[PDB]
Amino acid sequence: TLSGKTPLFAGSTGGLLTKAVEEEKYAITWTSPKAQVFELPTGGAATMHEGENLLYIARKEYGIALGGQLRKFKITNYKIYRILPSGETTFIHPADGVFPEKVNAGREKVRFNARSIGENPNPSQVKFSGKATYD
Amino acid sequence: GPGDFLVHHAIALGLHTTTLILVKGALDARGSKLMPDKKDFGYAFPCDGPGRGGTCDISAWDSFYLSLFWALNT
Amino acid sequence: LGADLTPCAENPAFQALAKNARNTTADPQSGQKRFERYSQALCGPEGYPHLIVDGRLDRAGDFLIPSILFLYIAGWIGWVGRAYLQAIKKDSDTEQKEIQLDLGIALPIIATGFAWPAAAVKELLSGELTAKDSEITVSPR
Amino acid sequence: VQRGSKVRILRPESYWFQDVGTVASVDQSGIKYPVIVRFDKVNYAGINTNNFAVDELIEVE
Amino acid sequence: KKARVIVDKDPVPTSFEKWAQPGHFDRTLARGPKTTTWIWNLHALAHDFDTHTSDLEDISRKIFAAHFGHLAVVTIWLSGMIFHGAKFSNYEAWLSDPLNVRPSAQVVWPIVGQDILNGDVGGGFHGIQITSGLFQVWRGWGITNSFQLYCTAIGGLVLAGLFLFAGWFHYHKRAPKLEWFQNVESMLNHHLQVLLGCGSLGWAGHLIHVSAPINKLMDAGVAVKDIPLPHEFILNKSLLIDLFPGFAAGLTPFFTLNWGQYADFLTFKGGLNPVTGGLWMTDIAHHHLAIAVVFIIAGHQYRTNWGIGHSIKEILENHKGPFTGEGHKGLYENLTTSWHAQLATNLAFLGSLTIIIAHHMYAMPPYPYLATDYATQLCIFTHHIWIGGFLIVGGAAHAAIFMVRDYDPVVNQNNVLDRVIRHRDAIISHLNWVCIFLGFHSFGLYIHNDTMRALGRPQDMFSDTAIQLQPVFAQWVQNLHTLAPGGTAPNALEPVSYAFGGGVLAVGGKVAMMPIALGTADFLIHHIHAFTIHVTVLILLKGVLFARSSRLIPDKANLGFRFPCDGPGRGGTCQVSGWDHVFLGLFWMYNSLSIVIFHFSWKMQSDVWGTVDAAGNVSHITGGNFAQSAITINGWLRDFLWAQASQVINSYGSALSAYGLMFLGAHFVWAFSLMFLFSGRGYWQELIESIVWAHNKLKVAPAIQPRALSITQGRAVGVAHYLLGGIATTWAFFHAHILSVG
Amino acid sequence: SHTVKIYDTCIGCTQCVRACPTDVLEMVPWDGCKAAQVASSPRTEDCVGCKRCETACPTDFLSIRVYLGAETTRSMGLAY
Amino acid sequence: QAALYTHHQYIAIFLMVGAFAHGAIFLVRDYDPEQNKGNVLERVLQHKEAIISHLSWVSLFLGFHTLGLYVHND
Amino acid sequence: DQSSYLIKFISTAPVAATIWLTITAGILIEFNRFFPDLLFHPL
Ligand code: CLA
Ligand code: CLA
Ligand code: CLA
Ligand code: CLA
Ligand code: CLA
Ligand SMILES: CC1=C(C/C=C(\C)CCC[C@H](C)CCC[C@H](C)CCCC(C)C)C(=O)c2ccccc2C1=O
Ligand code: SF4
Ligand code: SF4
Ligand code: SF4
């Protein structure tokens, strides 16, 4: 499903280790208007192609970091995918196609506490219970 | 004599400063201005990150750690 | 008082030290003048002046007089310092007046710092020395 | 409390807890912390403003 | 394009306004202080000109003006040293009796009993004995009276004035444009040919016309008053002919290539003058002449305005091979657009040069009556090693600052810099390994030896009398250098240094220099040096190579050069910044150089320095205990630190008492540093909260809110006091010891 | 994994979301503040515990908190 | 005699640091403000700034003058 | 005015401190020069 040619000068010792084969791997795709030089997540000046680029990355933070650099190149169409050893590619960023800093209807509040941080219980109150003070 | 005077006053300094570190550690264990919700993070934790000017050695445990240097010095 | 203390003018160890007394300053009699002054102190066995700090009036020069003179100068410095801080807080650019002294404000305060004990008592007995505990920032308990 | 009113903070986790701040504005809506209070001294993050609920404030002026 | 003078006129109006506006230079600081962090930031950012303005031209002008400022303070210092020589010294007494009189150029005022520090230094003079070697410098210069020093001091104050004016003028009045600054080819030409070449030719002039004659007469035992003034050797040729017959020939032999006619005042003697134990002035003369010619030739390499010459960009671009892709392409842009890239280079290589100078100056003492002044020898070696080590770490810092701030991917794609970034894991992993290998097979041998000696098994030790580790290569090189005169250096009489071999040379009763034999203790300590240098490089290289990113923090370049961490996440990211690698490299630089100066101190005192019997038997200062003692840590603790610290600890009630006080003071400052290094900001901010509460309670709470030092400042203050305390301790130790035994 | 809780003192400035180097956080509709949006932490399995979000948060005290919990490969920031 | 005095003084120092460590662990994990409403422990926590500030003073006061006199003498 | 700017610079924390502590040091050094070795107030 992941289309895009690997950028030129993409090679370095900072690339994928055995984790990429055994645990999980990430990909970041983006469409460039023009072939241009960009710093790789783990060092080395790579060259983007005009059109679809595919870069495999060890960590999602590499994708978000590179994403931030692509924004400085006026590129906001970058998609990060998590890839499992079974070849189960999962589109993970942006989750719902809209960037998380922009508000999108349909998203529900997760881990919201309807109180000020000062109104948390004391650790003594939740002692020998399953719950924590921030629950 | 005078030698015993100066060193007893060094020992006093030692006892007060070890106490200062430990009492401050104890009485700020639940929270402070820098970390008001410190009780939520427990006794030992590394820090609360470099925000708010930096919070290295902010936990109650980190007062124990600092105090033992002074305990040994004393 | 105790621990083999004698008057320095009676201690043989003192006289032995006085005969080979080093000149502190350019004055070539400064070495002898020192031991002439220290003769009135109490000396230990080795012939060094030991100071008695128990509030004995015959040893008032040892600690009691230095104490009064220090507390008067230290209290001056503290009062003048406090006075200036309170003076600049009534202005607009208070933080700038901390790192860049308003000598117009500071020098009069410094001049009138001689009368700090009167000012300290007056301000203690007016409830103008301290702030209320309820009006001072504190940590969550 | 309204615009210009000096207020003391009652929020115990506030940097300015029991410190006086000036009310910059009060948001006329149903929001939980409508009163924007400015302060002379900055907190550890270096900000000098924060939103408070009316119950967390005591008008002093 | 053509190198030319192009300046803006009146770019910055001169006014005291901004002097009354602390932090004017930074937009953030300009708003003013709110917390005490502002006061630190002011000083921290003061000379960080890249953060003042974005404009490279404005930065270049600030840097050029600041340099005139630093030249002015260095000239004030050098003028002060010479003035203190002219007014408050026993220089003239020391000239009359170099071997007996002790150099002193600092007199203390009689106050609170500190006049004790004015010890009997000889020449009916009371002052602090100086270890800076100024007297040996001035004797080498051919200065023979206080008036010549006064003239030189005043001349210096005028030059310092000129340097101040220059800095004001070249910033406020006529500031060069960026075009001017980026003429690297013209700058290299002028700095090679004029600064170094003409400076060396000029100095050859002074040596040949003034120093060599005056020193030759002083070595012939002629009284200082009886020696003619330096201008009398020019005005009266007959006097100069009598010392150097070659001057009879005049200047025609120079122009007709009959250079052998100058063989008497331009020599290749080698070794040392037996009278003074310093290098021959005639050798030094020929050196500076030869240097001058090579420099004046060298500085015609780079193309300026006449087509002839190399462009450095074309040289760099052409040097590429099958391992290095584009090779040195793009490095010209790095070094001509980044001041940090130039400062990195210049600090790294000036630092490396200063350490070479340290070595070359002890082994080949260039000044008269330096070799036998064991206090001066130890102190100038140690001094220049320290300066060297700090400059090298500065090189690494500014290399990392370049990588974070000024590195461009576009300029540096598939070049040597780009390709090192791409195998940085392979570089650091291998350097990590060689550090552990050297650590085990250098330090572990000391631990082996300590344990064997402790277990009563000296036969099982790594020693000359047990399992030998002879440095055969260094031994072989010493031999080659000893056989050089007559062989592979036919026109040399003696070796370059008696350290390599030849005889013991002695001046007065004392050894100037003798062969420095290398054995197991010398093999072990050399592999300790290799270890401690490789670990410092590991830290600093890791700092530069991982400054921009790592497998842990991909966007480290965005966090900047100097940030404390990226929080307790990822297990904890404390000290990942390039700044924090410099911080850690300083401790290792300190550890490394400490063992270098300790090595030098003990080896020289045990195996080189000492008295010489009429028969010719050498009695060394510590009686050759290095071979058997310096092979265990216990031996270093006992026979070096414990043994030689006796002078500094027993110095109270004497002229050396100050070193005893400095020794304790420095031990204190060092220990104080551990408060900053072992603790964290969080604790101190919470303590300040309670102290601020009490000041609030009595209405003395400052408007500028007190803050605990930044995480980075905590570390900066830590390492500052640690280095100050540690280095100052050794300084007090070395002085008190060597001013007693040496 | 680490736990990231948002508190009702949130003003919906979006600075925590922008700061986050592993897209843990996102803005969701809310009626509680004027900005009419609140921070949420749907993807805390991707949280490394850097606390950049807390450094970003302009409220006193913070409206976002990271409680460092069970360390995993993702939370330890391991590429191996 | 030297061994036995040093031994027990070192143990005493560890026990004393532990006392304060576990006192801080109590405050952060076990202490219920509601159950200790109005008692001596709540009051100590109410003026903890006053306790810590006066400990800071005694430490500084001892430290400055004791190091002072030693350095004067030295 | 350039006088006003100098006075502001002189009154700046580090310059003001330097002048004041130099005067304080000067007073202490000179008192000890003319009245050395005062371990206590004589009676
Ligand atoms: C006007 C200035 C002033 C005054 C009246 C006080 C008063 C006090 N201080 Mg504070 N303090 C000050 C400045 C001042 N301080 C400064 C500048 C610092 C930073 C070093 C501190 C750091 C400090 C600490 C760490 C502690 C105190 C404590 C205290 C209290 C106990 C006495 C003491 O320990 O002295 C301590 C004295 C010093 C640390 C040195 C003071 C430095 C100079 C001499 C003072 C500044 C003078 C100023 C420049 C004058 C300008 C005046 C001019 C403009 C007219 C007492 C309320 C203690 C406390 O909380 O007790 C309950 C305590 O632990 N102070
Ligand atoms: C020619 C040499 C040279 C030059 C021109 C520079 C220039 C610069 N350095 Mg570099 N640096 C150098 C050598 C040099 N450095 C060396 C040798 C080292 C190794 C220590 C470094 C390590 C270094 C670091 C780690 C950093 C810099 C930074 C900088 C920049 C800001 C400096 C500043 O604002 O200081 C302001 C001055 C101070 C804060 C005061 C310093 C006082 C020191 C710590 C102690 C002095 C003690 C003294 C020796 C003994 C007296 C003690 C007595 C007073 C008690 C500036 C571009 C900073 C930067 O960000 O670059 C962009 C930065 O973070 N430098
Ligand atoms: C004595 C104090 C001390 C010691 C022993 C160490 C040791 C080490 N440091 Mg550390 N360091 C120190 C102080 C010390 N440091 C301080 C104060 C700082 C703060 C500045 C640092 C900061 C620091 C940095 C920044 C770095 C180091 C690194 C290293 C390692 C270098 C590699 C090496 O030589 O391995 C060989 C091991 C030794 C020399 C230790 C002794 C080995 C013994 C003699 C042999 C083993 C005996 C036996 C088998 C023991 C086990 C048996 C037993 C269980 C029965 C080494 C483990 C570097 C590193 O990791 O690179 C490889 C590195 O980059 N250190
Ligand atoms: C008197 C009885 C006593 C008891 C019953 C406890 C019980 C407890 N303590 Mg407390 N404590 C005590 C005394 C006691 N402590 C003392 C005297 C101190 C001062 C040091 C402390 C300081 C302290 C701290 C700071 C902490 C505790 C904690 C705890 C709890 C967990 C301990 C644990 O799991 O660590 C497991 C054990 C270790 C990690 C032991 C390793 C350390 C040893 C000393 C290493 C020695 C080095 C080596 C073996 C020597 C080599 C020799 C050489 C020649 C080669 C547990 C409830 C922890 C807690 O969270 O409380 C709820 C906690 O953080 N204690
Ligand atoms: C020699 C080592 C050393 C020294 C001198 C200090 C000193 C201090 N520690 Mg620190 N500490 C140390 C090691 C040291 N520590 C270590 C290894 C640790 C483990 C991390 C700590 C952890 C620690 C903690 C956790 C605490 C302390 C505290 C203190 C202060 C106690 C107050 C006091 O009694 O003294 C009075 C002050 C001094 C003795 C300071 C020196 C005075 C100097 C010499 C005067 C300087 C004036 C002179 C003119 C300046 C010349 C310099 C020039 C460049 C201008 C004191 C400042 C406590 C504190 O702050 O209490 C208020 C505190 O809570 N320390
Ligand atoms: C002791 C210590 C502190 C406390 C030290 C502080 C806050 C430094 C303050 C000392 C200076 C000297 C205060 C100067 C105040 C005034 C300028 C003095 C005015 C009076 C003079 C004119 C005489 C930290 O903040 C810290 C932070 C991070 C890691 C470790 C540590 C650390 O170890
Ligand atoms: S440097 Fe300090 S604040 Fe940063 S992660 Fe480490 S302990 Fe925490
Ligand atoms: S701690 Fe770091 S990774 Fe986790 S939510 Fe906050 S910013 Fe994102
Ligand atoms: S949690 Fe803080 S930073 Fe994030 S949106 Fe809310 S107020 Fe802004």
Residue numbers in the entry:
A (entry chain D): 4 to 138
B (entry chain B): 520 to 593
C (entry chain F): 24 to 164
D (entry chain E): 2 to 62
E (entry chain A): 11 to 752
F (entry chain C): 2 to 81
G (entry chain B): 372 to 445
H (entry chain J): 6 to 48
List sentences from the manuscript.
In this study, we solved a structure of a PSI-IsiA supercomplex purified from Anabaena grown under the iron-deficient condition by cryo-electron microscopy (cryo-EM) single-particle analysis. After processing of the images with RELION, the final cryo-EM map was determined with a C1 symmetry at a resolution of 2.62 Å, based on the “gold-standard” Fourier shell correlation (FSC) = 0.143 criterion, although the peripheral region of IsiAs has a relatively lower resolution. The atomic model of PSI-IsiA was built based on the cryo-EM map (see “Methods”), which reveals a PSI monomeric core associated with six unique subunits outside of PsaA. IsiA1 was identified at positions 4 and 5 of the PSI-IsiA supercomplex. The remaining three subunits IsiA-2, IsiA-3, and IsiA-6 could not be identified as the cryo-EM map in these regions has a lower resolution than that of the overall resolution; therefore, these subunits were modeled as polyalanines. The PSI-IsiA structure lacks a PsaL subunit; instead, a C-terminal domain of IsiA2 occupies the position of PsaL, which inhibits the oligomerization of PSI, leading to the formation of a PSI monomer. Once IsiA2 is bound to a PSI monomer without PsaL, oligomerization of monomeric PSI cores to dimers and tetramers is inhibited by the N-terminal IsiA domain of IsiA2, which is located near PsaA. In the PSI-monomer-IsiA structure of Anabaena, there is a polypeptide modeled as Unknown in the position of PsaK, as we were unable to model it based on the sequence of PsaK. Unlike the typical PSI-trimer-IsiA structures, the IsiA subunits are associated with the PsaA side but not with the outside of PsaB. The characteristic fluorescence band at 684 nm originating from IsiAs decayed with a time constant of 55 ps, and the corresponding rise of fluorescence appeared around 727 nm, suggesting excitation-energy transfer from IsiAs to PSI.
